Amino acid sequence: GLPVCAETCVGGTCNTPGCTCSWPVCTRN
């Protein structure tokens, strides 16, 4: 839930381990 991945996911997917796409921002928990 935290936007601490230094990654956006406009296309729907995050590449940082442990991060998932809370569209359009990658989040960790």
Q: N-to-C SSE series?
A: EE
**How many domain modules?**
1
Shape descriptor: globular
Largest beta sheet: what is the strand line-up? 1-2
Structural class: mainly beta
Query: Rg, please?
Result: 7 Å
Amino-to-carboxy terminus distance: 4 Å
Strand portion, in percent? 15-25%
Total strands: the figure is: 2
Largest sheet: 2 strands, antiparallel
How much helicity do the residues have? Answer: under 10%
Q: What's the tally of helices? A: 0
Summarize the structure in words:
The protein is mainly β. It has one domain (1-29). The chain has no helices and two strands. The protein has strands spanning 20-22, 25-27. Strands 1-2 form a two-stranded antiparallel ribbon. The PDB classes it as plant protein.
Summarize the structure.
With 29 residues, the chain is mainly β. Helices cover 0% and strands 21% of the residues. The chain has a two-stranded antiparallel sheet.
Which helices and strands appear, and what pairs or packs with what?
Elements: E1 20-22, E2 25-27
List keywords for this structure.
29 residues; mainly beta; two-stranded antiparallel ribbon; Kalata-B1; plant protein; cyclic peptide
